[PDB]
Amino acid sequence: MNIFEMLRIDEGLRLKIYKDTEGYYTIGIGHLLTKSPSLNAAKSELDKAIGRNCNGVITKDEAEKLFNQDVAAAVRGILRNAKLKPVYDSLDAVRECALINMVFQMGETGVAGFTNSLRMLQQKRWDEAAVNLAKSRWYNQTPNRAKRVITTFRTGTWDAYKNL
Ligand SMILES: [Cl-]
Ligand SMILES: [Cl-]
Ligand SMILES: [Cl-]
Ligand SMILES: [Cl-]
Ligand SMILES: [Rb+]
Ligand SMILES: [Rb+]
Ligand SMILES: [Rb+]
Numbered sequence: 001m002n003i004f005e006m007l008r009i010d011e012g013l014r015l016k017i018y019k020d021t022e023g024y025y026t027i028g029i030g031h032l033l034t035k036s037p038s039l040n041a042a043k044s045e046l047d048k049a050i051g052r053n054c055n056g057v058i059t060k061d062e063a064e065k066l067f068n069q070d071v072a073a074a075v076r077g078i079l080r081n082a083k084l085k086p087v088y089d090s091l092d093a094v095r096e097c098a099l100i101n102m103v104f105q106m107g108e109t110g111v112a113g114f115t116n117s118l119r120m121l122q123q124k125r126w127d128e129a130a131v132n133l134a135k136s137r138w139y140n141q142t143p144n145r146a147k148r149v150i151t152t153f154r155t156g157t158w159d160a161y162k163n164l
């Protein structure tokens with residue numbers, strides 16, 4: 001396991017624009033294009049992201065290209081975020097993947113708002129953090145994915161992803 005394989009399990013791979021679990025236009029491996037309800041707005045975002053006239057369809061190589069950009073940018077953003085950087089640096093490499101996963105799904109601002117859970121993680125109070133993380137819109141709306149991420153935080157193992 002690693003962050004790419006983890007997020008590939010959680011996000012899937014689709015080569016045509018589709019709506020994510022929130023109803024938002026997405027493509028590839030969880031690449032959010034826009035929150036606009038306009039498919040045309042989403043198609044414009046896509047073409048700009050890829051650098052060609054895609055009309056809503058990409059290749060697997062292109063999907064992987066956006067995915068590595070998105071993972072790299074999630075890590076870089078965490079390290080530039082005053083709330084998330086200390087927690088990231090305090091965590092072992094497996095638990096860091098859980099944090100990257102959350103940022104990938106909900107964005108930096110959203111994760112940075114989990115003040116109490118972040119403190120528990122920094123304190124290495126793993127079972128307490130796991131309890132707290134579940135008390136969230138996040139968990140309610142995507143409970144099975146959140147369970148996997150939370151198990152990763154609680155245990156520092158890949159048990160919730162082996163073999164998905
Ligand atoms: Cl982009
Ligand atoms: Cl604990
Ligand atoms: Cl709690
Ligand atoms: Cl889910
Ligand atoms: Rb997805
Ligand atoms: Rb629409
Ligand atoms: Rb670390």
Ligand SMILES: [Rb+]
Pocket residue numbers: 030031032070104105
């Ligand atoms: Rb994403």
Ligand SMILES: [Rb+]
Pocket residue numbers: 112113114115
């Ligand atoms: Rb907060």
